Design a protein around this ligand. Sequence first.
Ligand SMILES: *[C@@H]1O[C@H](CO)[C@@H](O[C@@H]2O[C@H](CO)[C@@H](O[C@@H]3O[C@H](CO)[C@@H](O)[C@H](O)[C@@H]3O)[C@H](O)[C@H]2NC(C)=O)[C@H](O)[C@H]1NC(C)=O
Ligand SMILES: *[C@@H]1O[C@H](CO)[C@@H](O[C@@H]2O[C@H](CO)[C@@H](O[C@@H]3O[C@H](CO)[C@@H](O)[C@H](O)[C@@H]3O)[C@H](O)[C@H]2NC(C)=O)[C@H](O)[C@H]1NC(C)=O
Ligand SMILES: *[C@@H]1O[C@H](CO)[C@@H](O[C@@H]2O[C@H](CO)[C@@H](O[C@@H]3O[C@H](CO)[C@@H](O)[C@H](O)[C@@H]3O)[C@H](O)[C@H]2NC(C)=O)[C@H](O)[C@H]1NC(C)=O
Ligand code: A1ADC
Ligand code: A1ADC
Ligand code: A1ADC
Ligand code: NAG
Ligand code: NAG
Ligand code: NAG
Lengths: 171, 171, 171, 321, 321, 321
Amino acid sequence: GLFGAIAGFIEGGWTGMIDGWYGYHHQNEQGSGYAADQKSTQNAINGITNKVNTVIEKMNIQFTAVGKEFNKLEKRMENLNKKVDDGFLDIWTYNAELLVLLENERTLDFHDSNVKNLYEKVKSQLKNNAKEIGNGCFEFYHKCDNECMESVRNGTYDYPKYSEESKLNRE
Amino acid sequence: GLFGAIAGFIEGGWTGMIDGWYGYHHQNEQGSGYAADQKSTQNAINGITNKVNTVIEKMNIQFTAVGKEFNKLEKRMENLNKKVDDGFLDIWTYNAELLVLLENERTLDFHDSNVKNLYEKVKSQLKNNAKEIGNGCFEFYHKCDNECMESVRNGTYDYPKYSEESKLNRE
Amino acid sequence: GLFGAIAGFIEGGWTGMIDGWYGYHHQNEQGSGYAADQKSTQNAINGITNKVNTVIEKMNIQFTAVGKEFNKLEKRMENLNKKVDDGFLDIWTYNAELLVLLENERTLDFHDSNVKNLYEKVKSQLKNNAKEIGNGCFEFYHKCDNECMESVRNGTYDYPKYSEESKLNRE
Amino acid sequence: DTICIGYHANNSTDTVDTVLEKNVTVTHSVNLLEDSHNGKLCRLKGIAPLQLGKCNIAGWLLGNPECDPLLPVRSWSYIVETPNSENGICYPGDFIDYEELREQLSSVSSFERFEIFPKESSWPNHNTNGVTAACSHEGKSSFYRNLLWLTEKEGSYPKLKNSYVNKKGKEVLVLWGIHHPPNSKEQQNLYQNENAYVSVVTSNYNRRFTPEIAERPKVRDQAGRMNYYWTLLKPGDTIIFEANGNLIAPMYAFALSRGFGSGIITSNASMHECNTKCQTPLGAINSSLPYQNIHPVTIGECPKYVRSAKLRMVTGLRNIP
Amino acid sequence: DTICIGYHANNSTDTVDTVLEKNVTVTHSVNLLEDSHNGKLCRLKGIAPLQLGKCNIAGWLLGNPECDPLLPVRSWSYIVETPNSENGICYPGDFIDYEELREQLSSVSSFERFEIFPKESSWPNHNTNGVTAACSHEGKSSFYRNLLWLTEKEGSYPKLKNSYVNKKGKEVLVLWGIHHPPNSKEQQNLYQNENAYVSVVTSNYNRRFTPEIAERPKVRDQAGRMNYYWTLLKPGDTIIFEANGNLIAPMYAFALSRGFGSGIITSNASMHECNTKCQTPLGAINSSLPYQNIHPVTIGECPKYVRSAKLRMVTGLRNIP
Amino acid sequence: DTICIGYHANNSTDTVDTVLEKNVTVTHSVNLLEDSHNGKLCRLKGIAPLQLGKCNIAGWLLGNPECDPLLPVRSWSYIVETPNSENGICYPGDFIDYEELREQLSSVSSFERFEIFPKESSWPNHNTNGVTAACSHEGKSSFYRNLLWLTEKEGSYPKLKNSYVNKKGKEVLVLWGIHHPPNSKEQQNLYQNENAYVSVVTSNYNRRFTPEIAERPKVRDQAGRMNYYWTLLKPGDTIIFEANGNLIAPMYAFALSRGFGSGIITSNASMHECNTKCQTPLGAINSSLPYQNIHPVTIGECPKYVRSAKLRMVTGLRNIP
Ligand SMILES: *[C@@H]1O[C@H](CO)[C@@H](O[C@@H]2O[C@H](CO)[C@@H](O[C@@H]3O[C@H](CO)[C@@H](O)[C@H](O)[C@@H]3O)[C@H](O)[C@H]2NC(C)=O)[C@H](O)[C@H]1NC(C)=O
Ligand SMILES: *[C@@H]1O[C@H](CO)[C@@H](O[C@@H]2O[C@H](CO)[C@@H](O[C@@H]3O[C@H](CO)[C@@H](O)[C@H](O)[C@@H]3O)[C@H](O)[C@H]2NC(C)=O)[C@H](O)[C@H]1NC(C)=O
Ligand SMILES: *[C@@H]1O[C@H](CO)[C@@H](O[C@@H]2O[C@H](CO)[C@@H](O[C@@H]3O[C@H](CO)[C@@H](O)[C@H](O)[C@@H]3O)[C@H](O)[C@H]2NC(C)=O)[C@H](O)[C@H]1NC(C)=O
Ligand SMILES: CN(C)[C@H]1CCN([S@@](=O)(F)=Nc2ccc(C(=O)N3CCO[C@@H](c4ccccc4)C3)c(Cl)c2)C1
Ligand SMILES: CN(C)[C@H]1CCN([S@@](=O)(F)=Nc2ccc(C(=O)N3CCO[C@@H](c4ccccc4)C3)c(Cl)c2)C1
Ligand SMILES: CN(C)[C@H]1CCN([S@@](=O)(F)=Nc2ccc(C(=O)N3CCO[C@@H](c4ccccc4)C3)c(Cl)c2)C1
Ligand SMILES: *[C@@H]1O[C@H](CO)[C@@H](O)[C@H](O)[C@H]1NC(C)=O
Ligand SMILES: *[C@@H]1O[C@H](CO)[C@@H](O)[C@H](O)[C@H]1NC(C)=O
Ligand SMILES: *[C@@H]1O[C@H](CO)[C@@H](O)[C@H](O)[C@H]1NC(C)=O
């Protein structure tokens, strides 16, 4: 994708995370589990629901539209009516297919951006207290319990609390 | 936004910076102040002015366009004239509203990108001579006077000049 | 650009790299040379070829479309035929010019993204075994022969293999 | 201890297309194209259509005797013609401005069939019993139910003169015909005058008709012709018929009510006890989707017709399990 | 010591919409939709319009006496009709190809009203003083200013024959009428011949008119009818009128100049001493914006009409003070 | 030791436009707008066009003698008229529904010119040798090749009656004319009857024509007029002509075949030994591009016409050597 996260440095998705589009997987002495980031998922849902509604609202309802009849001496008028009907159908088919293609590309890039931004938020919090092991995973240089993991997930990670221990194990 | 700077890791804007769209705030022993980045602001202004002019230029001027009259035995032709007028109005209203919505989304993402790129330019210059304290701010590990601040703003920061002092205070 | 690589922190392009859109230049004791990244270039080629084909496929072939004749007592019908022909021409000219402008902007941003993602892939591999010297170049803290360079290019760089030597020269 | 950043995946096999890539499998998606219909003719917004059965518009308005007679008053939301309407005009000729009349009926929501000139009161000095084998009924010669073939009585065709004042408060559609015999011997036999004429006048209509006699190729075994004419009589206006021959006089007229959103369609589907907001000649559509690919002809509040086979917008992510 | 990266904010309350989000407050924005007009009829590119006042197109061209007479020569940029034009055709009948004539006038920029057949020189053997109560003026019976009702003189209606050669170098619009009395007694009284005819011929026009006599409903208290006809006489061409009755002869014709960008509109606004590049029936528009939502009918160089209520493009950033 | 990330550059000077920036030099690009044609009239999908030469549609169908006679049977893909077609109708008058006939011919792919009424077999009691100076040939008076001017023979004009049955299996286009002398002396001289009439009838066509005699301005030195009429005779149907004067009888008719994708264009280009899938009045287009800016009139499989001067999509990168 444009932001390099989905199908990029994060190779695959998580079937085990069913509660959201983006989230975290943790592993410490207390166990393991998946936790969706509710803030980013809900914000994305609102944006995407906005996009689909905008596409539907932009297309007015088609009210009654039937054909006309012409006698054998009105061929020019009949062909003009056909040219109008065919021309409008050409444009609306064109507009509809292109709008979906264009918005589909942006939607996938939008999801790619959210994953990258979420990744950078964690990386900017941990700093040198952890190391990038690839695949979007961080290995802590200190013990990180469930309360410590929750602090990373909600953006309140206490970096000074673990700096001394991390530096020792970072050696 | 798509690039995570505006309303992201930089929470809010600066009412005190009136001379540009993007810029710097500094704090040292000589005082504090706001300084807009003229290069990025002027480049963005040229791009945005380009976009608005392109939208206006793409819409040709509407020359004279009035209605027609039909007698009681020309109802089919009257309804064909109405179908043409309504159909064109449907398409142009559709094109106009969607173009604004699409370009508005890109314009906000364009500004988000400029802030992020400006942030990364400073970060790539300071390297380990300063530390990321969040909210888009850097705290220097050395004394940085007005001349030193100007070097960061115009891309000529002398990293080796302060490496020894920064390493000492970085301890 | 939107991602800041092309015409950004990588100032200019390489006329000496003729085998691809993105690639690497290396310099060690065994010599120097340009090597295109075949994976990213081929993927971009497939995407761009997709985009051009989609634009052409979305425009149906124009089958026979000639004018009509009207006598001196059919001026209203003649002007209706002109209004239909002019109106459709206005829309298709509008759609064609805007589609090219919009896709051209996205195409340049697409190439900018590929360079940035390629740069970040190398940076995430080398970590602290090398230093960012600007202009998109990395200076190794250890000897890196042709086999070592090939490992970076294909994503199999052995970071632990050189950590001790890099740390010594990093001093 | 480790923490990882990741994204959702599932068992979805939905695919979408983008400008850069096709057949992208995605976790969630929304279909925007309606392609399903029920295959039935339904009531539209609570009002049933007017089905003409074996008749087309021309046959119903003139009163072709081979179609089942309708109730005196009908109200509808759209008009259905069968694709093989064999019963139309039965005596050959020209229906003047027929297509314009069809366009007028496309905005009519109700009719009342009433006797404008009563059969046994309006023409005391003329014969009104004329029938033809072209408009047969049950194997016997007959004629249009709404018209009357006036001919000579006791060897004479007096100059007739009759009028009607529109006191219905709605437009009244009046139809009549002009007969053109194939030779002068028949013209004298039926109408007793060779230089005959028909005059029809209202406040805004003024036309004079004259027979044009010549031998013609047989159409439905008739060398004669009948030309059919109509006009809309405004509320409060008078129509006057004057003729000394060849007039196919009106007997029943239609008081018409104007409505919105109606139209005429051709369909072989059957009427069912169902209600819809959108009707096509193939069937009814129950959908809130913005597009459909079922039929370009629509009545009611309908999705926009497009030629596309698939219109799917991705809502979720690329699916990589 | 610290340095920070930031972006602009201000007190702006302007909002824009995006595909992903609505009611986004932004620092700077540009309105693209013109919604203001001055509510007046103005000169268009330095040329004043032709206001018909109480007349419609039909009344002005025929010369209805209830409208103020115009100057012999006028040049305009557009034509204004009032929504309640009571003065049009005053003697009831049909204006043949009236809508086509209106379309022709939409590309006319000037007229010269000149005497094609002088009143006291062209018809020495016919009475030209005919007037009717339908075309009244100041409570007295009158007639069209551009036409002449020819009737019998001294009990005789000689077969007239008059012609005009177009030496104006521009198209000449000629109008005439045909009278249809309601009974043969009046036809003989006015024109002395029962089988009368009117012939009008040019190099490209060739039509013959014959009266059609019948009793008709009273329209403006007249059971008779007058049918109005017109043709465009090409430069250098001749028109010949031949009749032995029922001709409403032309007296004044119009030499027409062709222009570009003109049209006919209906408006109740008043003319003002102003100049504009864009005129709508509601008022004039002074704007460089690409869109407007004021009126779909426009004359001049105008923004494109759309149904939208708001079209605002953001130029600045999201505003977060 | 160093490793660097970079991108391609070359000597390309191609420029593209974006919404944010114009005159962007790019490494690779694709032109989408076809602006080249060969300037010749070519065969379309292997079929040569029908070139009318000095004739227009009217002159060819009536058989103006100043044009080179065509082969009895022709099949074509499109019809070419020259911009200065001087040879059309040579005897002045009106070609009724001429534009409708042109529209019919736009979907015709073949004709067979055959004798519907043989010259020396169909009119034994009438003179068929009438010629006029208006339709001259080699400096001598002549007449249309497909029509016959019937006049009196031995001081008498018997009431003629002739018919043709369509046994061609295709529609037959029949053309005829009606002559209007400028005075009654000539009407009696040519046709011996003053109250003459012409009748033409088929199963779906029924019209009666009557001369209208008056002095008219000279057009091509003729004060008389000839009105031209046509009808399409359905397969298996009969057409009957009945007249006692003024009939310009048909002699040759056209059996027509229906096709797809054809049309009529005006062009001064010359026919060449070439083949194309797309033909414009300026020349043929050989291209797979989606757009063209050569001409809005196209025949065949053609790119879409747009007003743009440049439509270039970038495929490569911004070029910064
Ligand atoms: C369009 O996108 C779909 C979504 O993935 C593609 O469908 C998948 O295509 C593969 C290959 O044709 C199908 O078969 C698989 O092939 C391997 C090779 O032998 C076989 O061992 C597997 O067991 C499997 O059958 C796969 O079932 C199919 N998945 C579906 C239909 O859900 C498709 O190929 C794309 N392209 C087109 C042109 O449709
Ligand atoms: C559309 O966008 C505008 C731009 O912000 C929104 O306008 C603002 O809406 C709030 C809430 O309705 C207004 O009232 C505020 O509410 C708090 C709660 O009590 C009150 O204490 C504040 O003093 C303030 O009055 C606010 O004034 C208003 N700002 C404006 C109009 O400039 C608006 O809500 C958005 N939505 C819609 C549907 O318009
Ligand atoms: C459109 O984009 C093209 C692509 O670069 C621009 O073309 C280049 O423009 C420059 C300046 O007009 C040309 O001249 C150069 O100027 C310097 C100044 O003296 C001179 O020393 C150089 O030797 C050189 O001649 C340059 O040749 C030209 N390159 C081309 C045509 O390939 C162009 O300016 C842009 N703008 C417009 C309005 O076309
Ligand atoms: C006329 N109809 C068809 C229209 C009218 C407008 N809507 S609507 O805009 F709401 N459509 C959709 C349809 C689907 C979605 C979507 O992907 N999910 C819904 C929210 O949980 C998401 C989720 C589920 C599991 C795990 C993680 C995330 C999945 C969205 Cl976001 C919007 C439909
Ligand atoms: C037909 N009319 C309406 C059209 C014709 C084309 N133009 S135009 O394209 F120039 N429009 C605009 C309108 C506004 C802007 C804009 O945001 N600022 C102007 C430049 O200083 C910016 C600034 C101000 C203070 C601090 C920081 C930055 C604000 C721009 Cl960039 C373009 C208008
Ligand atoms: C109707 N015609 C005109 C259409 C039908 C569809 N195609 S097509 O989509 F294939 N067009 C193009 C045209 C050009 C390109 C392109 O930039 N390069 C081709 C691949 O090597 C690229 C390269 C070369 C040297 C060094 C590095 C990279 C250059 C592409 Cl990617 C697609 C044309
Ligand atoms: C974040 O999680 C921590 C648990 O470590 C908790 O103490 C804190 O209150 C949470 N903050 C928010 C804003 O939820
Ligand atoms: C950048 O600022 C420094 C001040 O520290 C100054 O010496 C230098 O000349 C400036 N460079 C540019 C290109 O403006
Ligand atoms: C990558 O390059 C190295 C050379 O250092 C080679 O040993 C390895 O097999 C390569 N891997 C792939 C997947 O090409």
